[PDB]
Structures are given as C-alpha cells and as structure tokens.
Amino acid sequence: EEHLQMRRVIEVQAATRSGTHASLLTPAERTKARDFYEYDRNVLRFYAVWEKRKFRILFYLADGSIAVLFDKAENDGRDPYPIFVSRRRIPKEARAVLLSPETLNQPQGPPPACVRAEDLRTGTSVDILTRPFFIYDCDEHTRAYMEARGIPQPAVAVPLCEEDEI
Amino acid sequence: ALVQSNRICLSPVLRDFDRVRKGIYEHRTCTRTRFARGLATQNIMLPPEQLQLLIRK
Amino acid sequence: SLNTVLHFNMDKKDEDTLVSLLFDGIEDENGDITYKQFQEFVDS
Amino acid sequence: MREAICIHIGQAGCQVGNACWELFCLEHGIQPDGSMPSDKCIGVEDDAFNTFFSETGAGKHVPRCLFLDLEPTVVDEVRTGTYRQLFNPEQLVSGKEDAANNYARGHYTIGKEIVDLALDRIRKLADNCTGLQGFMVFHAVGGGTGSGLGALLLERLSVDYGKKSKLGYTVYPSPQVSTAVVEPYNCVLSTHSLLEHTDVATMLDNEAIYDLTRRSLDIERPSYTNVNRLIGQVVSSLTASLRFDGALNVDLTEFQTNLVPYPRIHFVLTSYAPVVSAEKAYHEQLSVADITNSVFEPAGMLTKCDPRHGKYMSCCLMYRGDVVPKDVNAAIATIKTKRTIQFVDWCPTGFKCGINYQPPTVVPGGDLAKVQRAVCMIANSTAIAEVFARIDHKFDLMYSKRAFVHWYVGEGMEEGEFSEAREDLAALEKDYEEVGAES
Amino acid sequence: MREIVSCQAGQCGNQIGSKFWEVISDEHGVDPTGTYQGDSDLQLERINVYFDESSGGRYVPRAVLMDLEPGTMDSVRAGPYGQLFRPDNFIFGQSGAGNNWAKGHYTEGAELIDSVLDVCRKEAESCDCLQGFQLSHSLGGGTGSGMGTLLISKLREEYPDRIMMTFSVIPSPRVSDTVVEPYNTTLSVHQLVENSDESMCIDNEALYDICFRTLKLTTPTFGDLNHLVAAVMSGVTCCLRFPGQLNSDLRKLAVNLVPFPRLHFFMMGFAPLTSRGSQQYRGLSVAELTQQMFDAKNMMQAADPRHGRYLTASALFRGRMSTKEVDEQMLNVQNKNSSYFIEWIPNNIKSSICDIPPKGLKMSVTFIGNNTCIQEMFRRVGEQFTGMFRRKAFLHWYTGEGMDEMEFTEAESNMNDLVSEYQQYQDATV
Amino acid sequence: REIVSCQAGQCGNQIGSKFWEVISDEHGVDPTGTYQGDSDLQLERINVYFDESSGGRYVPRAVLMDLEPGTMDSVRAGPYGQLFRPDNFIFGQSGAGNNWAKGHYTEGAELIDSVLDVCRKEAESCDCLQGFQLSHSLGGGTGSGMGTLLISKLREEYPDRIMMTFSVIPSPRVSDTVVEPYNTTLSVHQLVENSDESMCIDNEALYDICFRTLKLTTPTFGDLNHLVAAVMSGVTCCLRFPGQLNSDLRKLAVNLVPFPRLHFFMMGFAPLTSRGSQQYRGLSVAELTQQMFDAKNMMQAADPRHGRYLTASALFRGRMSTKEVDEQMLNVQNKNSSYFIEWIPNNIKSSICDIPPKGLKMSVTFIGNNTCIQEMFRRVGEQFTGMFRRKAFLHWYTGEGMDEMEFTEAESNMNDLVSEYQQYQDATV
C-alpha cells in the first residue's frame, strides 16, 4: 500500500522531470475504470423519508456514491432546490467525511466502510450523515437488481409526510 | 422491408469498415461496433436488444 | 442547582416534581441529559 | 433557472439541431416520445435539463429550440422522424419557399414575411424561460436561409433582447471543398451580422470534420450525420458547464468576457478530443495530458485553420469527466514549455479551464467511443485571418467580373452593400493583423 | 462573547467556507444536521463565536453566502454540512458575474449587495458584541472580487472600528485559468488596501506544490486543497474559542503584524503537514514545528520568502506545550536567520498558545507572515496587467459595464506605490 | 367584556369564517359547538366571543351580511359553518352588483333593518358590549355599502361602545375591479366619522407575505384569511386570557388615537417564518420585536419608513418576561427616533398575554398609526379624481340614486384627512 504510494509519487516526479505522464494506474482508479465501463449510467433509486420529508436516494454503481434529492409538496414551505446531499461516497460514520489535518487523506488503516447497496434496503432506516432515511419503495430496475443480488425489496406503506398534514 | 422501402445499401459502408485501417483487401467479417457504425450511417435506429440479437445471430 | 442558582427552595415533593419534569424518559443510564433535551424542554 | 434557447436555421442548422437534440435527449434520459423512463434512473441532476427542456404537468419535456427553415424538406423530415413527439408542433417553422443560396432572398423577399412569427416563437420561448442565459444559433452562412434569415434574425434578437449572450455556431465555406459557387457571396454578405450582432462566432467548416473523421474515427465513409454528431458533441461539451455541476463551472458570459478581447474579435477556433473509435479507445492511455496535446495538435481541429500559421490569443478548455484540477495545470504547463504554438505578447495568461464531473455520453452507433474524459478547446487566435483571406479572395474573383450579382440585385438589394461587405472583411483582416502585431 | 461573522463571496470563497464551517463544526462538536453532540464543555464554552443558537437545540453559522450564479450556491448547500446554514443567508443573483470585475462590482453586485448588507446587519445585530467580519474570496474571479470588495468597503463604512479580515486566493501565472486575473486583481487590491485591516493571500500554485511534495498526494480534487486553508482559518481564531496559556485575538494579531496601515498582506502557513506513509515516522515536537513553519517551501502562497525580509511574524500554537520551548525556538530562528528579518523591528515574532489542538492532533501551529516578498507576487501580476492595458485588450467589457478608463490607471498607481512601500521598508536601515 | 362581530361581503364573510375557525381552535370548540379544550382558561373566558345555548352548544356572536346569496352557502357548508346560528345569515335575492350606491342606499337599505334587528338581539343577549367588530372590503359593493350603513347605524345606536373595523384596502397591483376607487372613496369617509378604530389590510402585502416569508408556491385566499385571522384573534388576546399587563379594545384605542380623525392603523404579526426557516430560526422576544417592525413584514401595502409613527401597540402573547418586552421598544425608539414622532415620545404601548397561540411559544401583533396611510389614501384619491374628472362609471350610481355632491364631499373629506395626516407628519416642536 505505502510501497505502491511511493512508487506512484516517484513516478509522478519522473513524469514532471521528463515532461510526460504516468503510464500505469493506481489500483483505485483501475477499479473505478472497470466500474465506469461496466455500470455507467446505472443508478439505484430508493424512495425514503426523513423528518416527514420525501427523499430520493440515488446509489451510483460506477462509484458507490449516494445522492439525496428532496421531493417537494405543494405549499410545503421549503425551498425548491432538490439536491440535499450531492454525489459522493457517504461513510457509515459521519465524522469520517472529514480528513485528518496532518495527512489530508483517509486514516492509516483500511479504508472506512461506506453505505452500499446491501445497506440500502426497503423497510429499513439507513443512516446517512446521522439522518435515518426510512426506505419504503424502489423503482422496478432497482427491485430487480436487488432481487438478483438475493436481498428482497418489498414495498411498504409510506410513512407520514408533510403532504398529508397540509 | 425497410430496405426496399428506403432503398438501403449497407454493402459499401460495411465493405469500407471491413477494409478500413487495414491492409487486408477483404476479410468478409467485421466487428459489432463497425456493424452498428454502418447501420447508423445508413440511419437505421434500432433498439440495443435488437442490435445485440442481430450481431449474435 | 434548583436551590443554589434557581432559588426555588420548595418542599421535597415540589423538588422531586421539578427534577422529574426534566429527568423522565430523556435521561441516560447515568442520569445525564444533553443540551438537545434541555433546550427541547425549555422550548416545549 | 439557467435556461438557454437554441435556434436552428437552414438545412445545416436543422440537421445539426437534430444531432444536438438526440444527444441531449439521451444525456438527460429523455426518450424520443419526450418522457422519462419511469423504471430506471440515469442519475443526471434533476434540474440539469432545465437549460434545454421545459417541463410539463404531464411529465413532457419540450425542447427550448426553434427550428426555422424556409423550405419544408428537413422540417417535415423532423416532423415525421423518430423525434416527432419530442418537439413542439409550433417553433418548428417551415416556409413555403427557400432562399435559393441568395442572401438577398433570405433577407429581403421571404425573410421579412417570416421573421415576425420567428420573433413571436422566440418571445414565447423567452416567456416560458425564467433565467435565460442566452441564444445559440446553429446555421451555415454559406447557404441562403442560414445567411439571410440568420442575419435578419440575429439583428432582430439584438434589437429586442438587449445584450443577451449569443453563440453563432456557423459552418463556413471550407478553403477547397465547398458545395456552393455563390457561397462566398452568401458568407461575405452574412458576415455583417456576425461582426456586429454575433456575440461569439464559432467556425465549423466541413473539411476539418472530414479530415478528423478520416483518420480518428476509423471509418472510411462518414457523412453529414457524423459531422453533425461531432458538432453536437462539441455543443454538449461547451454547455455542460452550466448543464451540470463541476470543479470549475462557467457560463456563457464567463467564457464570453474571458475569450473576446475586442468587440470585432469574437471568432474562435474549435477542437475536440479524445475523438476515437471503439478500436482506438481501448488501446490509448487517454490521460488529461494526452488528450490536451491531441487537442492542441493541428490535425485534431474542427476548423480548417492551421494554428502554427497564426498567433494564439486566448484558449478556453472545457473538460468533462474525472479531470483532477491539477491535470489541466500540468497540461497547460507542458503546453507553455513546448514551443510549437506561441501566444501573443499582451496575453500572458491566455488560458481558461472549466471542469465538469459529468463524463461525455455516446449516442448508439455514434462517432465517439465511450470515454471517461474529454476536452474541447474554444480558442480565439489570429489564424482565422487565413480563412478570411481565403474567402475574401474567393469573393473578389467573382465580384470583379460581377458574376451572380444580378441574382442578388434584382430582388431589391442594392449593389454597394457588396462593396460594404468587402471593406468589412478588409477591416477584419486589418484588425487581426494589428492585434497579432507585437507591441 | 466575541463574534466573527463570515462572508463567503464567489465560487472560490463559497467552496472554501463550505468546509471551513465543516472543520469548525468538527471542533465544536456540531452534528451535520445542526444539533450539538459534543462531549466536552470546551466545545460549548465559546460556540457563540461562530454560531447563533436556534430553538431546536442546534446552531446556525453566522455565515453570509454570496454569488451571482445559483450553481455554486446549490453545490455549497448540497454538502454534508450544507444544511447547517440559514436558507435566508443564501443570497444569489440569476445572472452571473461572467467573471467580470466591473459587472460584479457595479451592475449586478451593486443591486444584490443591498440584500447582502441587510443580512449582514441582521447577523451583526444578533451578535451581542461583534468583533470582526471575516471574508473569503478570490481576486481572480468576477463576483468573488468585484462584489466582495464592495461588501468590504461598505462594511468598513458601517463598522469603522471592527476588523475586516479577508482571505483572498491570489492567482498565479502557472495556475492562471482566465485572461483577466490581472484586471480583477488590480481592481481589487486597492479596495483591500483601503478597506481591510488585514488581508491574507493564498496561491493555488503553492497549495499544489505543498500537496505534491510535503503531503505527497497523487490526484485529489479541490476538497483537501481547500482543507489546508480551512484549517488555517480555523486556527487563526483559536484563542477566541478555546482557552490558552497566552490568549490572542484578531485585533492583537493585527496590532502585532501591521506596523504601517498600508502593510497588512500576509503569507500563510500550517504545521505539521505530514504524508500518510510518514505519519508514524515523525515525532511531533515544537522544534520540528518551528522548522516546518519557517520552512520556505511550506508557505501557503507561492512567493519566495528568503528573497525578502520578514517585517513581522505570528505563530498560533495549539495544544499543550511548554512556553520557553516555543519562544526560545523563535529566538533561535531570529538568531540563525537574522539576515532574513529586519533589524529596526526587534522581536519580529508574535507567539500565542492555545490549549486545545485540532481534533486528531497532538499539537499544531498556524503561521502568519508580513514578509516583504508579497511585492514579488504584486509585480508579477502587475506586469501582466500593464501588458494587457497597453493594448487595451479585454477592456471593452469593463468599459461597457459603466467603469471608466481612469480607474484602471488609479489601481495601477496604488499597486505601484504599495510595491514601493514594501521595497523601501525592505531596504530600510537603522 | 363581550364583543359582537359582523361580516360583510364575500371577503368579509371568508375572513370572518377563518377568524371563527381560529377562535374555535384556540378555545377548543369543534364545529359541532361542543367543547374539548384541555385547558380551563379557555372556558374561563369563552363567553367573550361565544354564547352558549341551553344545551351547552357554543354559537358565535356573529352576524353575516351579503346581498348575493352565493357565499352564504359556501360559509355554511364549510368545515366550521355549522357553528353559526342559522338566523344570523341575512341575505338578499339580488347581488350587490359591485356598486356602493345600491349596496348602501337601495338594496342594502331594505335589509339593514333585519341586520340591526339581529345585532340588537345579540347585544341584548350580551350583558353589555365591549364593542362591535366588522370585517369587510372597501372595494366591493356589499362589503362597503351596507357595511358602512351598519357602522353608521351602530354609531347612532351605541355611542359609547367601541367599533373596530377590519377593512380590506384595494391596491393597483391587486385590483380586480374598476370602480373600487369610487367604492373606497364613498366608504372610508364614512369610516372616518362612524368608526372608533379602523385597521387597513392590503392584499398586495398579504400576498408578499407568502412571496417572501412563508414562501408558499400556491397560497390561496384561505392562507390570506389565516394570516389576517391570526390578527383577528390576537387583538382580543388580553380580553380572552389573563396576562401580566392586561389591555382591551378601549385600552388600545386610547393609547393609539391622539386625534379623533386619525384612527387608521396598519397591521403586523411576526411569528411568521416558513417551514424551512423555522428549523433554523431561534424564537425569542427580541427577534419578535425585530420582525414586527420590518417593512415587508407588515400586511398593509405601504412602506413605514416613508412616514412617522404616531402610536404603536405591541400585543405580545406567550408567558414571557417584561424587560425585553418594554426595553426593546425603548431600543427601537432610540435607534429610529427619526422614524418616530418627537412630540409624542414613547409612542409604543405593550401588552402581555399569558396564553400563547396553539402550536407556538410566543407571538406578537402590531398596531401602527403611522403617517404612511395617507400614501394609500392619496393614491386612491388620485384614482378617484381621475375617474371623476370625466364622470365615467357615475351613471350606475346616479341611476341607483347617488348625486354628484356626495362624491365631491367624499373627495373633500379625502383631501382633508390626507392634509391632517401630513400636517402632523411634518409638524415640529
């Protein structure tokens, strides 16, 4: 790991000296390259609720990132901007999103666990930035994908929202 | 049916894709990407499943 | 503090009622409450 | 919020618009029926299509485009094509008679009876929009409609919309391979609006596209469809900065004031890379530095103007994909180190970069191979003087003998405005020479 | 108690402040949702410095967000701590500045700055005894610089006695990604001089070099690039929010680092900055902190510090360290680098101690430097400004937005006299 | 003690229906009339607005009035329409016709007799009235005409009793009629003499409240009526509930009316934050004071910064302190002495009610006798003079029985009142 990082850093130094680019790739961008080539434009959509507000959780297979988009109700009173959490890899622990001021990278040990497709299930509350999003339903593509993975995604009754109360 | 309706000739574009970039005059075979190339250049929009079935056959 | 700072100095029953008004169902196993719960009680 | 209105003029404009709109539909996940898949999610931002598509209460997405052609062939082809349900029945204007490669016909005879309803459709689109950034007019100045009706329409837009941004994507006549004989007349007459009423003018001549697709796309026989696909890819790359989020998002004015130094200097070179086929893509390490070098090479240009023959003035590079912010810095640094190209002395910086996190999309069976990242350079440079001199000498050889002049004159345009166009081009050449001259 | 209200201007300023507030929320134990989850009373002791309490037991930053493009506004609001800010503090225009200083300062910024000042005045009135306005912007842009300077000037007019701290990201020729950095920077430097008690310069070139060589990172985006400036901004006001052996406020820093009113431009540094593989191999001590802090290559703005002389310096150490080992180290650097300092100003270095280091650090330090080498960057961008101005290129855009031709010459003259002041005080002798 | 209310026209009837829904919610009364309030203080003073029958059903002391029988059916069939007494719905066969002439002289005259009959019945049922209330709009026909007729008759019959009017003042940006200059001109001059206190509401400012503060995408007249009904309830909060510093309608009238002809107030209410904003807004009395003086917060479409405050009233609700209630008024007076009047220092009265509104912690209603009301009055006077210069639209009034001298007297009263406001705005010690 650290040996690979040393190889990469001196390769970058040599590239700067010779006016060229690093030929081979870090394993991380190798994995992202296969993920982009296999699962581009393939996104899992989950319908969830948090604090009586409807949200769409989009899980990107190409990167493992999650984006939360707010769904409005007429005369809800909220701002009309849908994006709640932008596309990024959301760690299980909220504090893990922010990095050590020494290193500016991930902690020394193994990379931290992040919210995944197995984590995202209907009828359960996934913790996203210390917000329990209770996923109640998913679209047909995501349901088929999860069923093929082997975890079922039964639709459940939607919890109470602002639309019911207004 | 689309061919006799629109006077479709995929032979020249397919031939050019067979002999493109290649010093081989003719191999009588071409890649799936270049087959889709020929269909698109002839403007035959087809579903991806239909195209996959055709190239598989 | 209910007697040192808040100057209540009422009877035992009133003191117990005051404590219960803040420390039932919103206290951990150590009897502590968070600023969260304190301000929720204040603004309830 | 953050809308942009497209206006397609002429055959070239209509076909370029067809390519651009199929590309936009499959970038935003909108079927030709004009709806959403409702079973799968592409993952594109929900407000991304607001710049090109207007919502409807039933879920329809109506493009913010006005097709305007004086003859019904291409417009009826659009009306009966795959995207018949996507486009509005209106804002699809087909005239009763074409301009016949006569800028005079397209500007004075049949343009006056059509620009009124064209402006009506434009103002309807603007009223529908709420944060209109500007107008993008796609046409070929070498034809009749795109020259005459285009010049009239840009004049009217400039009059009735103040200083709103305009992007004139124009297919100029190429130095050698040109399809029309009065095309020099049309271009020289229509450049009046381009000098004045065009806010940024973009060259998309056909020889450069043909040459690029000859040895980059690995296909022996591309055509106008492939040319329009490349043009649409360039348009999408340019507009993605305001379409989607990115590391350095820019807007029309952002690469306007950062690219146009003088009011008469707004013509800009264009290029796009990595423009590769399926066989090419999997074998090339398409890094940011590699793609930037391929962009700055003079074979990978979408305008037939040799950059080495001129002085680079200001280049803005729109990157899409996983471009880390300092890959572009490394590419710019190696560009400065390598001496093949040279900038003008009074523009030391001369560089812009705008990065988007959205990777480019590929139309099925289309030109581009599905690549992680790409970059398009829009570059103001003094090399445009070469193509302007080419078209001007082309025009003089015909105007000296007064050939084809009567076709323009007889409908009701005068003759002195041919000369007026002549010294307009002369002044353009002179100001290019002056700005390229060292201090 | 003492409050610092923040103003993010432009895309760069918004991006920097977005995670500056993230770091501050870490240090004060603020949950992303807004609620207070701290486990120590020190987090809540001075949480009112940067946050105003709400009715739900949470805290909202005293941050005013400014830009003429809604896209970066959505980007900053979509962050993990983007929900922390008050929605009414998001003040934006429909039409962007187009990266034009004239448009951002006279046409659109002028119209939107009324609401901006309304929100700023509301925040100031909410603050019981406000101490300073900190602003984050970039001089290379249009709305960050043009509208930011107008906000700075009118805020100085409204609050003459307060501290107008500014964090300006200065462009560099090797990183320049626009053609009007010289124009915008020249038009903004005079405003900063006349309306800022202290301006602090940031260079993307120096940031990239620090990431490449010291941090040794391969391809990280603007996130950890701004992490350094966010950490430095958090550390500037450390003694305000946490107790220390030698407390210091922003006025103390200004009086200790601004010998003359025109000289308030400061170069930045942070320490320690260690790569991932070398974390366990580095013994964090005050001596090595001093060495890294005064190291030429560790400075956060891309100007050579050993070419000029240090007028004044400030070190804000955080953690539990002894005091002579932090002041005798400063004595040592003066003694072995007396040629790098100025003789007629003895005791060049402020040293301040704060008992609470950043979360995850044994001990740290932020460095502020009023070196006479900022004039090198000033001349570097002024030469470009003169080169463009002689040929009047890219000037019609500025003229058509209402700005006159004489103001460019006035900005050039002010910038030249500032450079002259720096040079004469560098070469001044007893 | 008790207050008897009247609703005139469609606007007045809908405003009153929303007000009665708000009062029933506050006092814990279902539309069926029976009581389920969990607090004793609601039943302690439930009799001010409601009268209980023999069976215990609480019926409001409300009299409904509209020449057109259209809105009567709507308010009756509404969610709380069963509350009102069936014989308190007095209506005619022919509509108001959007004409003050036949709303005040011909059609309303033959029905004002029964209106006064039912008002007399309500007054006799009451021990002795604290006052009359009238909710109406001056831009309409029956809201203006027979409403002002009722005000005049109650002025003549009950001289010492208070009459408070909630009048909807038209604005050009909202104007959905062409004769509202005539109607307002012919109505507010009557309101000057026959009303003890009048309170102006403008739909432009009501809509701006949902534009900016509540940021409601499709706010309806129901939402606007709720916004005004918060005020409608909060005016009598001290009468209906105990507090540290009690007040009533005459309390406010005495502290707010320095001269008999200046009783036109502009209204505000400042626990108004959107659902998104309330998550971050830290509710406090100082912030309530800050919001209650905001120009855009006022529900009357005139900028208070352009005039000077004669008097102001701050009806605070919710068990709070008294320092930050009064010392905050002192702060605003000291820091905006230019906005206030020098010869009346301490223009602001405060009152405290212990019971807060349901679902809230603290609240405040703002009464302002500012000199910016004459701006509305002079603009409507200019519109009236423009209409009257060419005698346009006057033939309907003349055919119904109006004469030119009465319009001239109305505009003379307009100029007199505008000058009266101006000569105190520019007055110096």
Ligand SMILES: Nc1nc2c(ncn2[C@@H]2O[C@H](COP(=O)(O)OP(=O)(O)OP(=O)(O)O)[C@@H](O)[C@H]2O)c(=O)[nH]1
């Ligand atoms: N790049 C590109 N250019 C095109 C395309 N189609 C037409 N053109 C341009 O159009 C020019 C000829 O114009 P015309 O054939 O007269 O078409 P027009 O402008 O509509 O004029 P009319 O013949 O009257 O209809 C050629 O020189 C091309 O450059 C296209 O699909 N792609």
Ligand SMILES: Nc1nc2c(ncn2[C@@H]2O[C@H](COP(=O)(O)OP(=O)(O)O)[C@@H](O)[C@H]2O)c(=O)[nH]1
């Ligand atoms: N460190 C850092 N610099 C940035 C960031 N965003 C932009 N910049 C710098 O700011 C300059 C462009 O400024 P810009 O964002 O256009 O300013 P604005 O138009 O006023 O918002 C570029 O040269 C970048 O180097 C960021 O997130 N972090």
Ligand SMILES: Nc1nc2c(ncn2[C@@H]2O[C@H](COP(=O)(O)OP(=O)(O)O)[C@@H](O)[C@H]2O)c(=O)[nH]1
């Ligand atoms: N705030 C509010 N205003 C209303 C309502 N209904 C009508 N209006 C206003 O009243 C004015 C018309 O008054 P109108 O109903 O014709 O009076 P009428 O003829 O006497 O019944 C319009 O300008 C509306 O703005 C309502 O429910 N709420």
